[PDB]
Design a binder for this molecule. Structure first.
Ligand SMILES: [Mg+2]
Length: 725
């Protein structure tokens, strides 16, 4: 109802670690703690999306005891929970006893249909670090009476294998041959392979072999997998990857039936160019990528579009067309990561493999929702009317988001580097910037929504503050161009200029001094592997990657670069905070519910997961909150941003806001007016009329009715908030 605060739970931050910080959250002003998944995940999981037991609350977080202790402790200071749940899939680990049961007994297992496996004879688990023969030859498979172990993974032995071991009267590695181990493995209901020379014959999360989907569309599977979930004393739920479901609508109807229509439910689901959530999803919105990108585009200055475009082209010496890039990247991922699944979907749907890859690469939204959506939702890419089997399309719909996500989010976003502050999850790189009236129209359609407004998550490519700095370049492209050409002649890098160009922008976004350089180094390596041009996760080009790492060591080692960059960067950083405050105000005061990624209630520069997964120093945040004040804060002081978070969450509790009236450079909701300027490096020339005695809500300094320059109202921060009386 007022604000959500996302916490990344794990062993290093447990239910008890949360309990210690409840007074902080309360005083910050937030109403809901937005908890990461809490069912038992693999031991040591830093994130909890690799579920291994549906019927138990993760002991590494505090177990069932800690959770209810947390909840009751939290409610006792007006804090509610929105609990992240993961319906679609589980992890291949021995701690997943349901899955082990299927591996042991196959058709005799009650969990035979709980898992989305393709074939009825075997399951192929491409999880070996080497060829099976090599693994065996190295003796990396340890035998017991009734189980094998590989790299700490325990898998059971079926009846036939155990009969074999009794025949040869041998139950450890000492009393049998390598070809005996071989024979034993070949007769297991599971067949282990090298992770690169095997297609899984089961449905995954995207292309993650470790994760196998559960068949929640079957009513027994849904009941069992939501047994603990249904008992949770929580105000709300967030649904991970709902687009993976065979029938999301049916799933939401059963979830609503289960936990009642009063709970707040958000879905993780990426919306495209004009899409909205299905009317019949009894759901209160998404986690807010739509909002994020609307603000994100608004922060970008349109007048720099042509110049940034032409320089990018000139600097890499290659023109890049975005629509072809998107298309080729989806086709790249279809063939590289999902060839096995698309081969099967071709046979199921009676089409040629290429036509089907062409169709998936054509889809302009993440997926269609037959049998509820009409068949003409696939009409436009199925130009030849080949796709007709309803259930086949229903089946295909489960893979459609994986092509969009892996092709656009995890490939295109790491290649088209014109201005990477835009390369975000849920973005549309076909557009560049957005207007205030565009922003108003977006809000107008959401005036009564409680959907999340967020600018940073555990999956966003960057934190909001990283994007705010890089977007400043759009306002000063000429100066930007000068710097890059000098840096490029100064350093003489033996690498792809697209990688080099990428790096510079990343430094601009994330600069906190020329130390701690392993973060940017690891990130850039991740970037170019995602890009899939000179290297990949499956086949790292160690020779190229070393050139890239060499370049970055040279950079941090070049006094001329450091001094030049440092001086350019002072401007960026100064203007970036401004954009960040504008965005921040927009997040708390637009229609919808504002979300806070842990630690980002102050300045915080996070790159891509896993960099955005670093520990948050709550002790420090508490000390800042303790010493909070409204004068004379340096813009770059962390208390400046925290001040906004605390005062706008507070605003949310005292002033009614259900109302939205657009202004040329702001908007009104009740007795609240927001005035801002997304452009920050140039003085805004506008007259503004304050009709009535108002209060600067951050400064608590009354402003009297009258005409004003806008530049005087918004001052250094580029945003003001006015309340009446
Ligand atoms: Mg995710």
């Amino acid at each position: 109802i007022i604000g959500t605060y996302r916490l990344q739970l794990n062993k290093g931050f447990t239910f008890y670690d949360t309990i210690e910080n409840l007074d902080y959250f309360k005083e910050l002003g937030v109403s809901h703690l937005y908890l990461s998944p809490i069912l038992k995940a693999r031991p040591g999981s830093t994130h909890g999306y690799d579920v291994v037991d549906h019927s138990e609350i993760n002991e590494e977080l505090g177990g069932e005891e800690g959770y209810f202790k947390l909840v009751k402790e939290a409610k006792s200071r007006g804090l509610e929970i929105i609990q992240d749940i993961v319906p679609n899939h589980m992890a291949v680990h021995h701690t997943n006893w349901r899955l082990m049961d299927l591996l042991k007994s196959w058709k005799n297992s009650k969990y035979y249909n709980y898992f989305d496996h393709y074939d009825d004879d075997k399951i192929i688990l491409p999880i070996l670090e080497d060829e099976l023969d090599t693994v065996i030859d190295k003796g990396l498979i340890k035998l017991q009476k009734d189980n094998i172990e590989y790299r700490g993974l325990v898998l059971p032995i079926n009846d036939e294998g155990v009969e074999f071991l009794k025949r040869i009267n041998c139950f450890d590695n000492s009393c049998l041959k390598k070809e005996d181990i071989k024979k034993l493995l070949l007769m297991q209901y599971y067949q282990l392979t090298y992770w690169k020379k095997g297609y899984p014959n089961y449905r995954r999360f995207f292309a993650v072999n470790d994760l196998i989907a559960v068949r929640i569309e079957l009513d027994e599977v849904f009941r069992e997998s939501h047994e603990i979930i249904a008992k949770l004393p929580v105000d709300g739920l967030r649904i991970d990857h709902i687009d993976g479901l065979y029938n999301p609508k049916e799933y939401l109807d059963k979830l609503r039936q289960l936990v009642g229509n009063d709970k707040i439910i958000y879905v993780e689901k990426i919306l495209s160019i004009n899409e909205k959530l299905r009317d019949d999803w009894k759901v209160d919105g998404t986690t807010g990528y739509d909002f994020l990108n609307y603000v994100n585009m608004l922060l970008v200055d349109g007048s720099g579009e042509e110049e940034l475009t032409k320089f990018y082209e000139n600097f890499i010496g290659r023109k890049i067309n975005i629509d072809e890039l998107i298309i080729q990247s989806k086709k790249l991922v279809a063939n590289q990561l999902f060839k096995g699944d698309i081969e099967r979907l071709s046979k199921l749907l009676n089409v040629n493999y290429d036509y089907l890859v062409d169709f998936l690469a054509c889809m302009k939204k993440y997926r269609t929702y037959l049998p509820f959506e009409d068949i003409n939702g696939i009409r436009e890419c199925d130009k030849e009317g080949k796709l007709k089997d309803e259930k086949g399309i229903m089946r295909l719909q489960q893979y459609m988001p994986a092509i969009f996500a892996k092709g656009y989010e995890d490939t295109t976003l790491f290649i088209y580097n014109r201005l990477i502050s835009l390369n975000e999850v849920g973005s549309d790189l076909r557009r560049f910037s957005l207007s205030i009236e565009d922003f108003h129209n977006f809000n107008l359609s959401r005036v009564n929504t409680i959907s999340m407004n967020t600018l940073s998550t555990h999956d966003t490519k960057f934190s909001e503050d990283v994007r705010a700095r890089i977007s400043v370049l759009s306002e000063i492209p000429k100066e930007w161009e000068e710097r890059v050409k000098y840096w490029h002649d100064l350093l003489r890098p033996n690498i792809d200029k697209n990688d080099e160009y990428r790096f510079y922008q990343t430094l601009v976004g994330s600069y906190e001094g020329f130390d701690n350089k392993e973060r940017i180094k690891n990130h850039i390596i991740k970037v170019i592997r995602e890009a899939k041009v000179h290297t990949t996760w499956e086949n790292p080009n160690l020779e190229y990657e070393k050139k890239v790492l060499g370049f970055i060591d040279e950079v941090f080692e070049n006094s001329s670069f450091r001094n030049d960059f440092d001086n350019f960067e002072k401007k960026i950083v100064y203007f970036g905070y401004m954009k960040s405050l504008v965005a921040t105000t927009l997040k708390f005061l637009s229609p919808g519910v504002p979300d806070i990624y842990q630690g980002t209630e102050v300045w915080r520069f996070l790159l891509t997961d896993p960099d955005n997964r670093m520990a948050v120093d709550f002790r420090k945040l508490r000390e800042l909150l303790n010493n909070l004040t409204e004068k004379n804060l340096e813009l770059s002081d962390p208390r400046t941003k925290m001040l906004y978070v605390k005062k706008l969450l507070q605003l949310r509790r005292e002033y009614s806001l259900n109302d939205y009236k657009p202004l040329p450079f702001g908007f009104q909701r009740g007795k609240v007016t927001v005035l801002f300027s997304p452009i920050v490096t140039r003085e805004v020339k506008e007259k503004i009329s304050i009709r009535q005695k108002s209060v600067d809500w951050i400064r608590n300094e009354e402003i009297s009715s009258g005409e004003y320059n806008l530049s005087e109202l918004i001052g250094e921060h580029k945003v003001v908030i006015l309340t009446e009386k």
